[PDB]
């Protein structure tokens, strides 16, 4: 039977969407279907932000962030636990998980 | 329903909804019968003397019961300028 009313993607009122490669395995996946995560990480881990600040020649120098947008196919994402199998009724919930 | 000789062969002439005129079935358990007391000129409720309306379970299920009572009660004088014919 039909598992999702959206067919597991985000294509409505459209014929074709150009693909993207999974970050992990380089599989061609449609752009609307790929699991996309925007990550803004500190370039230096919090353990090393102190000793690196002491070694700085600049007073009050802000460490730059690392900006990245990750694309995963369904297999890449499920295996890495980026997304998980949800119950039949919990699948419909499409609000971001309440973690942050 | 009656036979040729005129006897009422009908058992159970059923009730009809006051709002939609539908027949209220024997197992329509969402149907209610509102009983509204008559009030004398002293402001007292007259004992055992009521205005009665019946609503089918269909009308109540659609949420139209409230607006139907407003209309039905206004025609009988139970209400004033609460229900408007033109929307």
């Amino acid at each position: 039977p039909k598992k999702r009313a959206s067919n597991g993607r985000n294509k409505k009122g459209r014929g074709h969407v150009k693909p993207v490669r999974c970050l992990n395995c380089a599989r061609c996946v449609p752009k609307d279907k790929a699991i996309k995560r925007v990550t803004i990480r500190n370039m230096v881990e919090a353990a090393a932000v102190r000793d690196l600040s002491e070694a700085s020649v600049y007073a009050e120098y802000a460490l730059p962030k690392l900006y990245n947008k990750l694309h995963y196919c369904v297999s890449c994402a499920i295996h890495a636990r980026i997304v998980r199998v949800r119950s039949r009724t919990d699948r419909k919930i499409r609000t971001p998980p309440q973690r942050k | 329903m009656e036979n040729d000789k005129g006897q009422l062969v009908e058992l159970y002439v059923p009730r009809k909804c006051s709002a939609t005129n539908r027949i209220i079935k024997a197992k329509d358990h969402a149907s209610v019968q509102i009983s509204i007391a008559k009030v004398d000129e002293d402001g007292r409720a007259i004992a055992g003397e009521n205005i009665t309306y019946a609503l089918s379970g269909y009308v109540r299920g659609r949420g139209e019961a409230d607006d139907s009572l407003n209309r039905l009660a206004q025609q009988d004088g139970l209400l004033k300028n609460v229900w408007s014919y033109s929307r």
Partner: protein, 129 residues
């Protein structure tokens, strides 16, 4: 496109009656619609109805009294001989004691009972009960 204004009129009445509404708006109007409604009104299946002139085909507002179980058209309008009326009433009507098959005869639009009284037949047009 719009191929039968009578079917649209009766479909609108059926949908309004099933939902408990006591009035329905019909567009467009026509002579056949008005004469079909007059037959329904004469037998008490509808109340007063209203014709609105808009310098076009027109509009109708019908008052419903909750007695109408179903009204419908028969497409196409089959030719009906007098001996064929019995077959149509058997298929379309719920019982032999009530309900009407509406015909268009050269004597005018009328129910199947009136058609038998004046011994006329035409094309079938619809039904009501």
């Amino acid at each position: 496109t719009r191929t039968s204004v009578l079917a649209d009129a009766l479909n609108a009445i059926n949908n309004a009656e099933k939902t408990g509404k006591r009035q329905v708006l019909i567009r467009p109007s026509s002579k056949v619609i008005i004469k079909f409604l007059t037959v329904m009104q004469k037998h008490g299946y509808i109340g007063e109805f209203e014709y609105i002139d808009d310098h076009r085909s027109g509009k109708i507002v019908v008052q419903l009294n909750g007695r109408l179980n179903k009204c419908g058209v028969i497409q196409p309008r089959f030719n009906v001989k007098i001996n064929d009326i019995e077959r149509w009433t058997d298929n379309l009507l719920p019982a032999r004691q009530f309900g009407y098959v509406i015909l268009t005869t050269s004597a005018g639009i009328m129910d199947h009972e009136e058609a038998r009284r004046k011994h006329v037949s035409g094309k079938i047009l619809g039904f009501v009960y």
